Amino acid sequence: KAVIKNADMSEEMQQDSVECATQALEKYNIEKDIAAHIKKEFDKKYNPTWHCIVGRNFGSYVTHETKHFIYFYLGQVAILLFKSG
Amino acid sequence: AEMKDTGIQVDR
């Protein structure tokens, strides 16, 4: 049950975020590894440089390229994926 | 090229 809280990317790039995060959740138990999976995939499919944060409790402030930002809920975790550089 | 500064708070 994905829930988009704040998206800036295209409906297509947005679908790839959810899907990609889904596979990582089906595979990894540790947030850091889930974050890595998603980051590495986006660096590949959409070129560097991306950054990913996964967790249940945190606040952040970042600088990103417009149309390249997404914050959403998947499972009981929240994912912040964005490109800068 | 066209940057934005965004903050997010997570408490689920």
- CATH, residue A81: 3.30.740.10
> Which domain covers residue A10, as residue numbers?
1-85
The structure was resolved experimentally with: X-ray
Interface mutation target, options A1, A60, A84, chain B, most CBs of B under 10 Å:
A60
Rounded (5°) CA angle A31-A6-A13: 75
Structurally, how many domains does chain A consist of? 1
Mind telling me how many Å the CA of A41 is from chain B's nearest CA? Answer: 22
A58-65 LR contacts (CB < 8 Å, sep 24+): A58/B10, A59/B7, A59/B8, A59/B9, A59/B10, A60/B7, A60/B8, A61/B5, A61/B6, A61/B7, A62/B5, A62/B6, A62/B7, A63/B3, A63/B4, A63/B5, A64/A8, A64/B3, A64/B4, A64/B6, A65/B1, A65/B2, A65/B3, A65/B4
d(CA A55, CA A31): 6
Q: Is residue A56 less than 8 Å (CB to CB) from chain B?
A: yes
Q: Between chains, do B2 and A65 touch, taking CB under 8 Å as contact?
A: yes
Q: What is the resolution of this structure in A?
A: 2.5
A62 vs B6: CB contact, 8 Å cut-off?
yes
Burial A61-72 (b: 16+ CB within 10 A, else e): eeebbeebbbbb
